[PDB]
């Protein structure tokens, strides 16, 4: 007694296999999963017949698919990203003003901020599984991307997870190689120091949420003991992202894109999202407000951007 089954690893490109229906999957392909279920230890029944299961790739025709589709070879990857889509793909995923959010479940909120953030600034993931995965999720099906997510960061579902190390990890898989920043560090001691940024350097800043500041001058320590003043020379970027240490600070319309929001203690608090549209929104998961400022503690901004140049000499 045997069906026809078909195996893949991308859910592109099948391969046909007839089962023996007194045996498990595991007895025949090894790990085998159903849309994210683990079916290893199941003997195939009627209701399988024609239906896709995800394999390991363990033979070059599959190896070759799944590096070309994913862009890793940690052997781990399709197994966390099967173990991942199987509670993913029973989150919702409500439009909230227009954008894909996450409705809150299993610690989801950096997942949700980074899945409303990544809708609202120009980047492009090199990965087709993330390409593919990134345009089902704006169309309102994003079980597939937030499973890739969890699988490309390490992250399993229901762990807390961090925003800007996440955006940090995607920033990693796409293609900011246009990307380019120009600092000067001015110490009024020791003098003077340009520095070039590319690609993830070029677009993320740690110690000021203001693309203003930075672009007038921040005050840091200089390594002679004093302080020197740090500012942006050129950015040739589509968006750049400012992050500091969590702390009330007052976002205002119509001067950012979006902004994540932590409020808790150390690793166990919780992220909002602010959007600066016709006004600000605060999507919370499903909830969303509204108001014409907003103060909270803010951990990262993103800001529009495409060719700056100081007028500082
Ligand atoms: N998501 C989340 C939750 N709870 C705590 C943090 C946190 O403090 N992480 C950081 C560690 C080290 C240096 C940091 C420097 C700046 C900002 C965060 C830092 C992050
Ligand atoms: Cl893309
Ligand atoms: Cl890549
Ligand atoms: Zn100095």
Redesign the pocket.
Known sequence: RTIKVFTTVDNINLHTQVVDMSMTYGQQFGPTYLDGADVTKIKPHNSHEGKTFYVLPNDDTLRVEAFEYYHTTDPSFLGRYMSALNHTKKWKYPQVNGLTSIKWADNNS?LATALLTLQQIELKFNPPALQDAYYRARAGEAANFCALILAYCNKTVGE?????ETMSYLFQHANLDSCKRVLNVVCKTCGQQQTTLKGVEAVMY?GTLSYEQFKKGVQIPCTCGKQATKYLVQQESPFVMM????AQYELKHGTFTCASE?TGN????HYKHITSKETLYCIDGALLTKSSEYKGPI?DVFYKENSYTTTIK
């Not at 807390?160 to 800007?164: A, H, K």
């Not at 992050?243 to 969590?246: E, I, Q």
């Not at 150390?266 to 608090?269: D, E, P």
């Open positions: 950096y807390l997870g961090d925003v800007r740690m992050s500091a240490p969590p932590y150390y690793q166990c608090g951990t």
